[PDB]
Symmetry: D4
Subunit: 146 residues, 8 copies
């Protein structure tokens, strides 16, 4: 019987920037392809700066741990706007950073920016090492731009 909703405006509003789903998909697929080429089996995830996972892809033959790991890696990379390889080394002086929920301070995640600000993280997991995971995440990032 009743209605209707309020419309905000002016300085009550601000805008944020994101990858399109199409771009995030393009990036994630590029990571898998690079891994599949090298005979690796990986899961890939793209997480928005807002915390939401935009894309996930579970590779054929990938380990059952790789899916969530890739997700947490992307989340970690976009949160601090840095490769998870780098972030893992801050734990020497700031070891309780890993106690932050949703994070995995392990190589395989790398950020993507727009106007110098992080908009997404691309996470990979499943390769024999996180550094190799990250190589594929970079390959994922590299189709974006340029």
């Amino acid at each position: 019987p009743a209605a209707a909703p309020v419309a905000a405006r002016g300085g009550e509003l601000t805008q944020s920037t994101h990858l399109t789903l199409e771009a995030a998909t393009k990036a994630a697929r590029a990571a898998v392809e690079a891994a599949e080429k090298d005979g690796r089996h990986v899961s890939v995830a793209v997480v928005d700066r807002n915390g939401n996972t935009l894309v996930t892809l579970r590779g054929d033959g990938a380990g059952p741990q790789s899916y969530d790991s890739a997700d947490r890696k992307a989340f970690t990379a976009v949160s601090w706007n840095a490769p998870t390889s780098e972030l893992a080394k801050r734990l020497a002086q700031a070891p309780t950073l890993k106690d932050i929920p949703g994070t995995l301070f392990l190589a395989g995640g790398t950020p993507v920016t727009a106007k110098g600000a992080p908009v997404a993280g691309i996470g990979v997991a499943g390769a024999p090492s996180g550094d190799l995971d990250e190589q594929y995440a970079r390959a994922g990032a590299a189709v974006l731009g340029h």
Copy 2:
């Protein structure tokens, strides 16, 4: 030893709209004030269209269930861009909607829009009824604009 991150651009990017924290705070505080005036004790929550909770306020004397309820109500209102009072009545023909995670199909949540699109939900819980919760949520929405 290594760096650096990729910059996306062009049609790989899109923008989204949100309430400012200041506006969301202003709205949430307005809901409490309206409840406090009528002698009610409530929790209030503002949830962004992206799913993230932007503001929560636990009223003095509020029930221990009101906090999470207000959060889920705001989440529900912004998800379907409608008052939770209305959404609760769709359950007659679509009863499994309540089985959607994060939702609470109970009066007390109302949406806020920008350019005809939902950007936030304002949720309230603690009053003797959800319809009264919603009155205060509307009072919260009403300071935005106009």
Copy 3:
């Protein structure tokens, strides 16, 4: 200092069948495209018969509830090898089916088979109704085969 692992064989082993990640991706992308064409904003998920999510895609402008909903819908469809639209109607005589963990008995999920057995479920959420979600899930399934 020590090793190594045991190798099973013979009737101790059996094989299972799955969609490739490439096929699951192709299907999920087809669902989004069909929704985007009709101006809808949806999340899509492909879940393997083994319970594992293989692909997720969060549409631009999709509701924050759509992601997990699509996942649970695909899981539900592949578990019972039936559209979630159909499964929702069994609740009249079997109402406690919805109490099964991981399920969402709501239109939007449809199964994919191999040799008459379910191998994947395709789930969609975000459209004004689950029946419309399911139309797009069918469009997703339809690029597979034929």
Copy 4:
């Protein structure tokens, strides 16, 4: 048909002390303002000594990890009545303290007292370091009193 509830009294009862929602809000808003001034993007949380979160504010541009981190920091500070910067250093001799649920032994949380007893913790997260988070949490505490 039936009623009614029992009323306790005398030495069966005791009283506890808390910040008002208005005071907790005032403090949390003061932390954001101090961060916003220095160009930082942070989430802020005020947690009661009873464990309940009273206020949360998610700053514009804040990292998606900052919200829960600020909450756990405030919880940690009020639990031990000490800055989380200090508490993080006890881990050298008591490293399993971090294994306590709900805690984050990382700078950014500081306690607030009443009659020499902790009543609230103020947590901040999002700045380049926890020590800087804590500076803003102190600014939040500083509007209370004096």
Copy 5:
């Protein structure tokens, strides 16, 4: 190297009222004793108005479901300041109340007050029916006062 914490005062503070642990224990033990006398095997819980569980007792021979049930019942009773037997009947007109987290709208929980305000809920579970659970919860409440 650094310190120290802020002290709040005046109208920045408010007081709340609670059962003592001794009183809550006395009540919970009285419920068990009444059940044990009638040959029943039950779990008992006392939950504070702030949401925190103060006391739990798992009866010998009690069902493995009774512990958490008693907890949720006490939480539900103190949240709405009413017997869970009564609250269960509001579901006819307000069926989505049960969707509130932490609740169990089933007989066995009854509130305890101080100055006309709820301070605790006493929950019982394990007897052949919730109405019988509630009888024992009332016996628990009855040693308080009078």
Copy 6:
């Protein structure tokens, strides 16, 4: 440097009764065999009266929902010492029983007793119906005794 632990005795102690792991395994395997014979694919679970799961078996080709369902069914059957087929029908007059954590009021679970008291529940899930699940659970129970 320090020790040692206290030894309780007398009326401070009581004994409880359980199925052996060997018996629970024998029963669970008998359920699978009966299902496999009829061409059904099911998961089976044996849960102790204390709430602990003693045995689980995931059938080949079983649905991904069957594992947890069988567990919750066994838990439900041993909690109320009755078939879940029967317990599902109490929901007409006691519909909030399903809101008890850990439960699934759906046919497929049946209790096992010792000295007239429940000691275990045997749960099955995966067949086209819960009544058929329960037939196999009974076959599981039937190898015990007699």
Copy 7:
């Protein structure tokens, strides 16, 4: 229409030993009393060897972290049949023990035995140190026997 349940017997059954609820309560209350005497504010928990929590008591003024900590400490002590003070020191050579779910390798938990086998753990948390927590847990254990 149908019934009835199977009765196991013989070597299909085994018996286990436990503290009575009365004994567990007596012990937990003794721990609080010893802490209250020394002016400490603590939560206490008694956990059965089967994993189930039998008793919890939240002290007046206790920290909001103490409740769950005491529970995990009791669980840890009864799992390994040793003081958590001792168990914390095994982490030097076996550091991944803390990664076991439900555990907290921190002083405050001590086991109780029957016939040389663990039957319960008594956990305490809230004092300025775990060693002091454990002193009170020992006082709790000491009223049992002798």
Copy 8:
């Protein structure tokens, strides 16, 4: 009124390999028997390479922590195709591996292969040490083949 589902084929499909439930059961039972012989009380788990737990067995007298530990150990062993004893030692150079969800880098888990690829992990927990747990897991693996 509507139907029916799509059938995938060709290169849209791939096959995976698994232990049969019968083989997994045979292995798990062999581990228990070897432990029971040496007077040890353990829980055993077999987890598929896809992440799903196929078999669990809770030994008589086993610690309440052993069940989940064995599960996580099997999951960890099959994820990296290596004994958890070995994997625990990678933490020296890759310490954040333990932060991967679902894992427990502690001796007691060993992999089983088919065609040089991991298909299952066998996990054991409860013995005085993980190395001894692993001995029994190997005994479990050893009945498979040869």
